[PDB]
Design a protein around this ligand. Structure first.
Ligand SMILES: C[S@@+](CC[C@H](N)C(=O)[O-])C[C@H]1O[C@@H](n2cnc3c(N)ncnc32)[C@H](O)[C@@H]1O
Length: 303
């Protein structure tokens, strides 16, 4: 049972950590940990419908869709990650576009981007590096008009070099694999992990920093997420942080390019909230549950 496992885990971690808290403090951390954590006992994926008619899977461990059912998967790729990134604009002028892709998933963002990028300029050479700890063998295929392009990408996984296209999806943990990427400054980072409470390793200040080294200054970092913790971390690293919407808003970041701007209530929350904390993996070797626990401890000023 998840509850049982999680409580043990927490109790166990606190002892290792040698933290001291009140009972009230303990109760509260546990209550939130139980509510925000994922399902470590589960694994596998389940097929599901999406509003725009594309398919997605639900990941049983994370308890989340690869893509938002409410938006539709193509629509999310397009409006949360492709457009806001601005690669399509850059494309007409440019001869190369580089994308850093965080979480290969079913390959939707990449496929959606490539269709547009190529429509805009057929001759563009595209460099993609992606990170995927759990590559799949069966993928739901995108409906037309993205089916051709999707299958084309899938054929080329995981390593491909071509006139137009360079692809590397590096299997394993991104935290490990990222250090290998050198001499790459991305035009776009598509940061598409499962949600931060769910998938904590990929949203720490520490990981984001590694991402930072790999982004062109005028490049854009995009995610569906508007997590306060994530935004606060981006600000810490020097990004300009902004919002994208197709109501739930996303985040757009750049070190030096312009970003659309958040809105008054967004700023307020960011200033006001207890939850506007970074999240922390300093060695980058931490267990995901742990990263979450550490966060709750900070948030609740047990620390
Ligand atoms: C939101 S999904 C991917 C959706 C995908 N971007 C798409 O466009 O179709 C999250 C992906 O991140 C991967 N992931 C989660 N944690 C990871 C880690 N530490 N390292 C690498 N990949 C991870 C998951 O296995 C999953 O493939």
């Amino acid at each position: 049972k998840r509850e049982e496992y999680l409580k043990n885990y927490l109790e166990s971690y606190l002892r290792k950590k040698e933290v001291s808290l009140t009972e009230e403090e303990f109760n509260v951390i546990l209550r939130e940990f139980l509510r925000f954590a994922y399902n470590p006992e589960e694994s596998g994926q389940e097929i599901a419908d999406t509003a725009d008619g594309s398919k997605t899977l639900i990941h049983k461990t994370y308890g989340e869709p690869y893509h938002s059912q409410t938006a539709g998967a193509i629509r999310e790729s397009l409006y949360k990650f492709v457009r806001p990134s601005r690669i399509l604009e850059k494309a007409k002028e440019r001869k190369v576009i580089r994308i850093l892709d965080v979480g290969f998933g079913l390959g939707y963002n990449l496929a959606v981007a490539l269709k547009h990028l190529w429509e805009v300029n057929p001759k563009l050479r595209v460099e993609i590096i992606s990170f995927e700890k759990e590559l799949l063998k069966e993928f739901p295929i995108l409906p037309e008009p993205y089916r051709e392009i999707h299958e084309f990408l899938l054929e080329r996984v995981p390593e491909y070099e071509g006139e137009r296209l360079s692809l590397k999806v590096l299997l394993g943990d991104a935290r490990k694999r990222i250090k290998e990427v050198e001499n790459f400054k991305a035009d776009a980072v598509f940061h598409d992990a499962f949600s931060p409470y769910k998938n904590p390793e990929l949203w720490t200040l520490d990981f984001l920093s590694l991402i930072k080294e790999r982004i062109d200054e005028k490049g854009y970092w995009v995610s569906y997420s508007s997590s306060l913790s994530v935004r606060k971390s981006l600000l810490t690293l020097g990004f300009k942080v902004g919002s994208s919407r197709e109501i739930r808003k996303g985040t757009v970041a750049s070190l030096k390019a312009p970003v659309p701007p958040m809105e008054e209530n967004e700023v307020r929350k960011l200033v006001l909230s207890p939850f506007a904390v970074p999240m922390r993996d300093e060695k980058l070797d931490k267990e995901p549950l742990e990263i979450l626990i550490d966060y709750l401890l900070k948030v609740y000023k047990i620390s």
